[model samples]
Structures are given as structure tokens and as C-alpha cells.
Target chain A: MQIFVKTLTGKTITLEVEPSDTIENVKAKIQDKEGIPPDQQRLIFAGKQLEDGRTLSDYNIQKESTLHLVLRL
Target chain B: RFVWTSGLLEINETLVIQQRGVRIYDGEEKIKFDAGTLLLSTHRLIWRDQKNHECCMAILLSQIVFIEEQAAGIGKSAKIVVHLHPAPPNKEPGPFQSSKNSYIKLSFKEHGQIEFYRRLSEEMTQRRW
Candidate 1:
């Protein structure tokens, strides 16, 4: 599935992901695309914090959905 | 002694001021307010309501145990959870006596949420008692 990410600064990026992909994997990708460290990134979807060890499907994340990013400075 | 500098506003002598800014939150009754000029010092977090000239909330850094992000709804708003020790009266006390644990949820708009969360988290973790 493809997911959209919106950063706190209002930048948006899209990425291809699998249902089995962990949130940490997604954070690594975001780190590559947005220059934010994975450890410093917090992703929220559907009013829940996506745990690093959990899979996308665990959170019921679907295609075309947006994950909000909060970066720790 | 109140000394107002361009950046740092001294509320008292002991607290070392770090950051101050306008912070918005869903306060009491779930009523959202533009909490004006939240002050982040080494020991505490303080904010006032500009509309009423009342202190909105003040939290001691020592009382805060952890801070985490919360999902409010589908793209509705950003929320942060602050876990506190010696929990407030409204919350259920923890297992240990005088060691009550409670959490307060502060909801914010996109940009404010990120900024406040970062600043508060930093202040909470960086300070040494």
C-alpha cells in the first residue's frame, strides 16, 4: 500500500509500504526522505501513536491514508 | 523581583527560564483556549489565559513521569499525554501510597502541537534536579 506523510512543518511525502512493514521501517524511510532521525520521529495515525515494533496492518492503516509526523528536536 | 527581558521573562529567582510562547490547548471542560505565553523553566511549566488573566495550568517537572503522543481522531488534531506522579485529585491514584500516577491530555493544532511537544519534552528530559 501507498501512504502519505505530512510533517509538522507542512511538508508531504508519499511512500510505498507493506501491511507487514513495521513502523520503524516507515520511520527509516521518512528519515531518508525528510532528513529527520528515526529516533526523533513520532508517527500518529487515526489518533494513535504507531509503535515501532508494530506492523501497519496492526494499526489498520490503509492505502492513501496520511500519517502525521512529530519530530523531537 | 520581576524582570522582563526581550526574550526571557523572569517569573522568580530560582527557575531558569528556557522557552516561552503562545500555547493553545483544550483546557477544562474541553474548552479550547489560546493559552498565552507558556513559560518553560527548569522546574516547571506555566501558562496563563490572556482572556481572563488567570493562570491556566502549572506543572512541576518533577511530577512529570513521561510524555507521549496521542491520536485524537482521524486527522482531527494532535494530542500529547503527560504522565504525572502524585496524580491530581480527579484521577485514580496509583498503587503506591503518595505515588499516584495520572495523565493529562493536551490537544493542539498541527504546528503548535509539534513545537510545544518538542519543547516540553526537551525541558522535561534535559533538566537535572
Candidate 2:
């Protein structure tokens, strides 16, 4: 399935993922698109910050779910 | 999200054009302080900010659906508006995030727009990507 990641600049990037994918994996995909490191990426979904080791299913991320990307150095 | 050449593979990629002081626009909005350098390769267009040399955004040449040059005004710089296709479904992590606009603009702070345009057209016509 695909999930949309929205940057602070209001750009939305679509990423393919599975429920079993970990938060780090999600961030890893983002690292390629945004030119940032996964360590610097902080993703928020459903009003909560996702952890590195947790799976997408852990936070109930479903198809077409939108995530907010918060980035820092 | 990370196309910083650290692990991003390059396939027969050769530098075609390079220029400095070029800024990128996501539709009508200018990307603040992104006026550093624009490097066009056989595969991608990479733009790096002077402040952040470690990371840069890249867009595939294959995504160039159309391009047109916008005349520069006295206060404005010459720009090339690039129409793009939607991001590929399975393209891997690399530098560049798609914006809502299907088209983005490249503003040349000084010269080089002409050469870049001509070379870009040459590349586009070759269909080498």
C-alpha cells in the first residue's frame, strides 16, 4: 500500500510500504527522497511520534494514511 | 528521501551541465536559500544549497515531461519551467520530495540559462534516459 508523507513545506510524497515495515524503514525510504538522514527524520502519525523499531501496523498505519514529517539536524 | 550520492547508485551517469546561483521553485513559491548550484547529469538534475553541502535534491531526467523558458524581468531572473510526471511508484530513497505542483521552475540568477536550455533540449530530444 501507499502512504503519503507531508513535509512542513506542504509537499506530499507517496511511499509504498507494508504493515510489517518498521518506522526506521519508513524513514530510510524518506532519506533517499529528501536528502536527509533517517536519524534526523521524525515522523508523526495519528498524533503520535513513531518509534524506530515499531512496525507500521503497530501504529495502525493503513493504506492512503498521511504522515507528517518533522525534520531536524 | 536521501539522494546524496552516499549510497545512491549512478548508472552511466555523466555530468552534462553545471552552474551556480540557481534557485528552484516549487510552483510559485521560491525555495528559500536554495540558490547554490544546479548540476544536470545524464540521469538527474541535482541542486545543492550552499549552507548544506551534505544533502541535495534530485529529479530524474526521465521525469521531464516538458520545459519552457520564461523571460526574465528587470527584477526577476530567467527561469525554465519544467513539467514533470508523477513520482515513480517504486523508485528508491534518494534526494528529492515531490511537491503538489506537476511543474517546478529553475531561476538562473545570472547567465547559463541559455546553455542549460539548449543542452537540456538536446538531452530531451535524444531520449537517452
Candidate 3:
């Protein structure tokens, strides 16, 4: 499945992942594309923080779902 | 409910706004994280370290001339530089130096740094009187 990540700066990036993949995995992909490390990225879905240990299925995230990405320093 | 204290207000001050878990630096030189809470009223901006409540710094809104944001190394980490009106030679030194101005780096562990930045900027612009 694929997901669209929208950054705070109004930029969006698309990523592909498996339903069984953890949020941490998605963060790694974001790091690859966005130059932000997993530790510094906070993913928000449905106004809730996405946990690293949880799988996409746990959050019920589907293809084309938009996730908000906030960077931490 | 409000408590009357000598430190509470000036002649015409009334509003108070605040943000927590903020790390503030007062100069161009980089320093380690100095975590604290920032309190803004109609008159000034105050920062107090949670560990040492007695250590507080205040900068009058009137003294601020401009603010600049610069990109930092990673994440959303960025540097905010605040320029202030120069002070008189005999004036006492304060948190924001009237002569030199101050700079703070926001390296937050979580989200909301942008929100805090926006709020502070808006407040500064709105209360320029």
C-alpha cells in the first residue's frame, strides 16, 4: 500500500509500504526522502501520534491516506 | 480569579500568554539545551527554568526591534534571532541585552515548536504599541 505524507511546509511525498510494516519503517523511508531521521520525525494520523511499534494495519491506514509529518529537533 | 502582586502588572497591562517546555539561548554562541517555560504578557516575555524557578529572564516587548529565523542542522531545529533597541550605558543588564540582542534555538523533542514560533511572532506584531 502507498501513503502520502504532508509536511508542515506544505510539501507532500508519497511512499509505498506493507500493511505489516511498522510506523518506524515508514519513518525510515521518510528519512530517505526527506532527510529527516526517524527519531526526529513525528507522524500524526487522525490527530493522534503514530507509534513506532505499531503496524499500519493497527492504525487502519489505507492507500492514499494522508499523514502529517512534524519534525523534532 | 487573580492574585495581586507587585510583579503582576504595570500601570496598563492585562493579558498573559504562555508556552512550556521551551529551550532558550540568549546569544549567538551555541549552548546545550536550557529547558524552560516562556511566559508572554502584554508587556514582556519571561522565561523560567523549571529546575531553578528563581532564575528568570524578562524582555519587554517594546525593546524588541525585529526577529529572524535561520535554518539549523536537522529536523525542524532552527535558530531565532531577536534584535532589540540598544540600551543606555547605565542600564542594568537583562535577559535580552538592549545593546546586543538575543538568539534562541528551538530544538524540540516533540511537535508544536512551529505553533509556538507562530504565536510568539503574532503576539510581537500585534502588541507593538
Candidate 4:
């Protein structure tokens, strides 16, 4: 699925990846695009989180969805 | 019979300044400036600046939209939204002082040297959300 993401500074980025991609991998991609520290990052997709090792497909993220990464200050 | 206007103005796209002064309009009507004075726009909020130059004027624009006086409840008291257009270049950066009720021409320049102001100004003029 292709996911749209926006940073706090108003920068938008898009990522195309398989639904089978793990949260760990998504975290890596977010860090790469948003310059946010991975450890401090929290992804709030549809207002919930799956088991740490779960994939995007597990959370019901279909094709062409958008997700936001909010930095936990 | 000049009315002094006090509140906020947009310095640049990012900085916000709350100006305090009596806004003089066509040399008639003097509106008093008091603390807690707030002016609302679609993108920015103008308020009294309580500093050494307490009445020194300033404006902060933060993506504000100026609403029509009637629709905004301007002059009805409490969160009055006074409708205003971007002052033409010649009339902007007012030349007035509040404390002395004197007119002192003031000029302003941008700090970031960014041309984003042109876009910001356009957004302010649109009367829609």
C-alpha cells in the first residue's frame, strides 16, 4: 500500500511498501523521511497500535492510506 | 477626533507581535487602549503589547482571516472582530504614538528576507476558510 505522511514542519512524504512490512520497518522509513529519532517516535494510525511486531496489514491499513508520525516530546 | 487602534499585526509569516496604541482613523474618534485588548483575524490575533514602549505598535499574522464587522460581532463587545483590509503600502506601519497621542511615522522590514509574505498576504484577503 502507498501511505502518505506529513511532518510537524509541514513536509509531506509518501511511502510505497507492502502491507506485510513490520512496524519496525515503518519506524525506520519514518525516521529516514522525517528526521525524527526512531526511539522517540510514535505512529498514530487510525488511533491505535498493534503488537510491536505486527504488520500494517494486521492493523487493517489498505491501499493508498495516510498515516502520521507525531514526535513524543 | 482620531481613534487609536491597538492589537496585533503580522511581522512576517512566522513572527507575531501584539501592538498597543490608539488607532487613529481619519483624525476622528479616539479609542482607548487597555490590557486584554484583543483583535481577531482569520490568520492572526492583534493584542496590546505591554512593554516599555507599551503603546508602540506591532502586528502579528498567523494565517488569520479578517471577518466582516457584522458577521464577526465587531463592536458588540467581547471578541469583537473588526474588519480591515491590508493597509495600502503608503498607509501601513502607522505613524502614530499612543501615549502622547502623537503621530510618528513607523517603517518596518522583514527579518528572514523570505518572499513568503506575498503568499501570506494573498491568504489573508480571501474571506473563506
Worst 10 residues of 1 chain A by lDDT: A4-13
Fnat for model 2?
0.00
After superposition, candidate 3 runs with Cα above 4 Å error: A1-73, B1-16, B91-111
Q: For residues B1-129, what per-residue lDDT tens digits would candidate 4 score against the true structure? A: 113344333443333232233232221223432343233344444444335345433343422222111111442222222222222235566544322221211111112112223333344554223
Per-residue error for A17 in candidate 4, Å, reads 1.3
Best by TM-score: 2
Ranking by TM-score: 2, 3, 1, 4
**In candidate 1, how many Å is residue B71 off?**
21
lDDT of 3 by residue, B1-129 (tens): 011233455677754556667776545556765786766677776766677646566677765544556676675656555544443334464333333423345444444666666766776767744
> Which one wins on DockQ?
1
Best by lDDT: 2
* lDDT score for candidate 4 against the true structure: 0.43
For candidate 1, lDDT tens digit of each residue in B1-129?
Answer: 012233333465244432333544432236644545556666666665556444445666766545777676688556776644432234474234322213455554424667677777667656643
How good is the docking of model 2, by CAPRI class?
incorrect
Q: Every prediction's TM-score for the first chain?
A: 0.92, 0.93, 0.94, 0.80
Every model's DockQ: 0.02, 0.02, 0.01, 0.01
Model 1 agreement with the true structure over A1-73: per-residue lDDT tens digits: 8999875333579988998999999999987887778998878775446799999999989889888775542
Which pairs of residues have clashing backbones in candidate 1?
A: A47-B71
lDDT per residue as tens, model 4, A1-73: 6887644333467887799998778888877876666787656565343345888889877787866554432
